[PDB]
């Protein structure tokens, strides 16, 4: 599980950070259930400072499209 | 998913941090598959500075008993 190494760059667009996150989940064959938990947690945590505050502000349970919107 | 709020205290024993982590996973009815992923990731990440370095040093894939031993 090398997901802990997927961090959003200092000036990396959230969109790209997302492709790199789920692209790693596939390789490690994460079930759909796991992806849901990772989205609520790790995706949020491994994001850059500004985004992580925004995402953390959104509340637990926002959809992926809402997260991308809040950090475009 | 309020797991993101389970952080190891500055002087909290790893053992107690672990009970608080899995005690939260049950409540949210995490399957056994999810718990495995959370152990490899979130458990490690939400640990105090010294422990997180030790755990990060252990390599991905150490068992829970090995983690507790490395941070006793």
UniProtKB/Swiss-Prot annotation, chains A, B:
Phosphorylated possibly by host MAPK1; this phosphorylation is necessary for Pin1-mediated virion uncoating. Residues 1-72 are annotated as: Dimerization/Multimerization of capsid protein p24. It is found in: Virion. Forms the conical core that encapsulates the genomic RNA-nucleocapsid complex in the virion. Most core are conical, with only 7% tubular. The core is constituted by capsid protein hexamer subunits. The core is disassembled soon after virion entry. Host restriction factors such as TRIM5-alpha or TRIMCyp bind retroviral capsids and cause premature capsid disassembly, leading to blocks in reverse transcription. Capsid restriction by TRIM5 is one of the factors which restricts HIV-1 to the human species. Host PIN1 apparently facilitates the virion uncoating. Homodimer; the homodimer further multimerizes as homohexamers or homopentamers. Interacts with human PPIA/CYPA; This interaction stabilizes the capsid. Interacts with human NUP153. Interacts with host PDZD8; this interaction stabilizes the capsid. Interacts with monkey TRIM5; this interaction destabilizes the capsid. This is Capsid protein p24. It comes from Human immunodeficiency virus type 1 group M subtype B (isolate NY5).
């Amino acid at each position: 599980t090398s997901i802990l190494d997927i961090r959003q760059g200092p000036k990396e667009p959230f969109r790209d950070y997302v492709d790199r996150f789920y692209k790693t989940l596939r390789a490690e064959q994460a079930s759909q259930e796991v992806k849901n938990w990772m989205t609520e947690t790790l995706l949020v945590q491994n994001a850059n400072p500004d985004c992580k505050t925004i995402l953390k502000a959104l509340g637990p349970g926002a959809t992926l499209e809402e997260m991308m919107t809040a950090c475009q």
